[PDB]
Design a binder for these strands. Structure first.
Ligand SMILES: [Mg+2]
Ligand SMILES: [Mg+2]
Ligand SMILES: [Mg+2]
Ligand SMILES: [Mg+2]
Lengths: 141, 139, 135, 139
DNA sequence: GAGAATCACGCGACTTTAGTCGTGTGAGGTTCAA
DNA sequence: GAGAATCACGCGACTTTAGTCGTGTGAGGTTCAA
DNA sequence: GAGAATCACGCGACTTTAGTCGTGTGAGGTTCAA
DNA sequence: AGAATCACGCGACTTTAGTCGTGTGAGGTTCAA
């Protein structure tokens, strides 16, 4: 026999002047020519640089994984932080700082680019789209 | 007793000049003073207005539910479509058009506002943050 | 602050439940015979058996060499019993309705003697465990 | 335009004579009259009893939480283990053993029942139903 | 004041030989929601 | 590439009185992965 | 052998004043998939 | 007894009205998605 039940859960979302939000993004990008250079101290240095850039731009880093040829970040941002801006900030500044800190990168990357010119980004929720859709439907009546 | 099986999962994404993406947002906002005015043809008129605005701004509507005192939207956008810009377009233009199309709203909303000044927005994924974090960890 | 999430369930005399199973089984020898009208007939037969046994079919997909079913059941409906009901009866009926199946299946079996079954929930196990901790 | 992504992910499953399966259940039940007696050593004793019964019956305990007035179990079973049978084994035997081990429970429960006569049970999967259905479509 | 999953009473099966499971039904009997 | 879920043979229960479920075991007998 | 996200060349905008983002196009120039 | 929500201030820009951006404070159409 059909029976709708309910569950109570604590809602911990971020608040701002005229907005309440919870915005997370899975951002991915590769090394130019997919060169496997992000290893050892180079990988460690990149993490420090990224976390610094994130802090400077008020971006919260949830998850950061550096693979030899690409990076995976899960960031939390405000509604005012446009995607292209923070991607540029992260990739552009890190490329600059990385070449300075690790000139040896120029051995495989002498064309003036550390990163692939493309980025991959997906919105991330705690639960799923389908689950959110049911929540919305349950709001009627 | 267990054996590790593995399956293939499909994921629909969009492509642009220098980016691959899948961006969806759950946007919510209420009626000013939380007045239950979004009912009957008022609600239907709002849906038509919102879909028009969305289409004009190149925003894909995944879900649109209009409750008496608030609206729930699920939108799909490009990386170049900033949040405040589309929220403004949606709320601002709809408030204007709604008052012109349904002047009777002024009975309970005479202060020049149809919408509460605040909006609530959440990023949306087909998989859970936990699942995604597990995926990331499996390199 | 607080959010009220919905959860659809069923009720019986002394129990509240939500039981769904993803059931899978293949054709004997993995022959690709479930095509065209044979596939359509199978679906009719399976829905009928499901109805006769009070099993709700949520999803059903018939591939040339195997079947996928997502069923809803009561706590009292034991797995082996409904799997037997679905496979045994469908095998019988299919052979009568489609004697052409005997071309590649003459040994008296339409189905592989094994079945695959997984329990299914609306939320992941991880989500459920998180809810459990919040109690 | 669109881009179609495909990711590979693991899935644990058990094998038996004529079946391959992964069956988990979230079982819940409350104390009779919802009395908050499952505390301290009483709660601890219950856990030992439940794990013993589960082991005696070949049921694997994935998660077990004992609140003052109810119990949450996440069990893993074979296709042959019928729900009513294992619910009876767990609640019935624990009620019996608990009263003998902790006679003090009789203070609030003198009617011969430790448990509410009802039980709640849900099938559990590692992935969500929507994802599973989505998979079924991909084949 | 009143229903059920939850309270109470009936019943059969079966382990735990007590106190659940299966189960129909009604009333103020230790209950009020996981 | 031979072991099993899947092939084969045995067994009892029970619906579909055929061909599954329950089940142990071994060989080359229509199989090869959902 | 030849397309783009990824390789290359064009182009503003703006930080990191270098090397991204925005962006159109095309060719065998350090690339081949998160 | 505060703020997201109520009110008053303020540019920017569409919808030239009523949002977005935004700081502050008072009790003045509000009380939670
Ligand atoms: Mg670029
Ligand atoms: Mg605002
Ligand atoms: Mg079998
Ligand atoms: Mg009972």
């Amino acid at each position: 026999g059909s029976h709708m039940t309910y569950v109570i859960l604590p809602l911990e979302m971020k608040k701002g002047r005229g907005y309440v939000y919870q915005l997370e993004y899975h951002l991915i990008w590769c090394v130019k020519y997919r060169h496997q250079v992000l290893v050892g101290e180079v990988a460690d240095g990149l993490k420090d640089i990224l976390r610094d850039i994130a802090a400077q731009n008020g971006l919260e880093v949830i998850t950061m994984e550096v693979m030899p040829d690409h990076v995976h970040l899960l960031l939390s941002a405000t509604p005012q932080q446009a995607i292209p801006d923070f991607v540029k900030a992260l990739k552009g500044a890190s490329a600059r700082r990385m070449f300075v800190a690790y000139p040896q990168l120029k051995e495989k990357l002498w064309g003036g680019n550390l990163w692939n010119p493309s980025y991959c980004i997906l919105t991330v929720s705690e639960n799923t789209r389908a689950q959110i859709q049911k929540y919305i439907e349950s709001q009627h009546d």
